[PDB]
Design a protein around this ligand. Structure first.
Ligand code: NI
Lengths: 8, 253
């Protein structure tokens, strides 16, 4: 499980 | 509404979305998909002031196709997905998929018998995804027969060990970019045995982790509306992460 990204 | 209290407030209204999927595959030695499905769930972690009414939209005009669904008893009938989330962390939905799934890895087994003394094994894996995405925690398990006296192995990537007490060569690779391929070569040395029934070969097994939904699912948007408080949808900070992990992912050989 990973690093988050901006939704957009 | 017995799952969210009245006076919640955060300056810095933020939400995190987790899209978690395991992709299961049974494949013939020639590359025919014998069986395949994805089961997934969306976890939401939200820190939002007040009593926000959220709208979760994804690329499933059915653009992927969902076989089945379960929602947190907080989502409302119609049409789209609507709800006032519990504060913090909860499971938004479980879903199932079977069509047009993306198989991140293609395992290609090659097995030659050499006399009654030795088995030659070559296994190739191929990353089937964008070259700029990285897979990790890659593990390939090649079963070995009961009457195995020892094993030779070479691999230009990762590391591999025969574990006798487990009857498998285990190949470990830290990361691999999409659109690549890797070889492993093994020579399996055999003890004399009951020449009757052959080796009923278990399939070659695989584990991996990828930063995308193998179902092809994408979050299109998550919209927050809190009619009362000063903040609106554009004030909310939004994050997403996709983790596709292998469930059962085997290739007969
Ligand atoms: Ni969190």
């Amino acid at each position: 499980s990973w690093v988050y990204s901006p939704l957009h | 509404i017995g799952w969210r209290r009245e006076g919640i407030k955060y300056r810095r209204n933020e939400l995190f979305l987790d899209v978690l999927e395991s992709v299961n595959l049974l494949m013939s030695p020639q590359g025919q998909v014998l069986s395949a499905h994805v089961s997934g769930r969306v976890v939401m972690k939200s820190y939002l002031s007040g009593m926000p009414e959220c709208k979760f939209g994804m690329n499933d005009k059915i653009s992927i196709a969902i076989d089945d669904c379960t929602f947190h008893q907080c989502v409302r009938l119609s049409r789209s997905i609507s709800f006032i989330p519990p504060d913090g962390e909860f499971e938004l939905m479980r879903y199932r998929t079977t069509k047009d799934i993306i198989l991140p890895f293609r395992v290609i087994p090659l097995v030659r018998e050499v006399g009654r003394t030795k088995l030659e094994v070559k296994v190739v894996i191929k990353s089937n995804f964008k070259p700029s995405l990285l897979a990790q925690k890659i593990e390939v398990r090649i079963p070995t027969p009961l009457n195995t006296s020892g094993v030779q192995v070479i691999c230009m990537k990762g590391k591999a060990k025969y574990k006798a007490s487990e009857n498998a060569i285990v190949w470990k690779i830290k990361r691999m970019a999409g659109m690549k391929e890797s070889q492993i070569s093994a020579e399996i040395e055999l003890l004399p045995t009951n020449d009757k029934k052959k080796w009923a070969r278990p399939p070659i097994s695989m584990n991996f982790e990828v930063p995308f939904a193998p179902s092809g699912l994408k979050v299109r948007y998550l919209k927050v509306f809190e009619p009362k408080l000063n903040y609106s949808d554009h004030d909310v900070i939004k994050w997403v992460r996709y983790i596709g992990r292998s469930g059962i992912y085997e290739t007969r050989c």
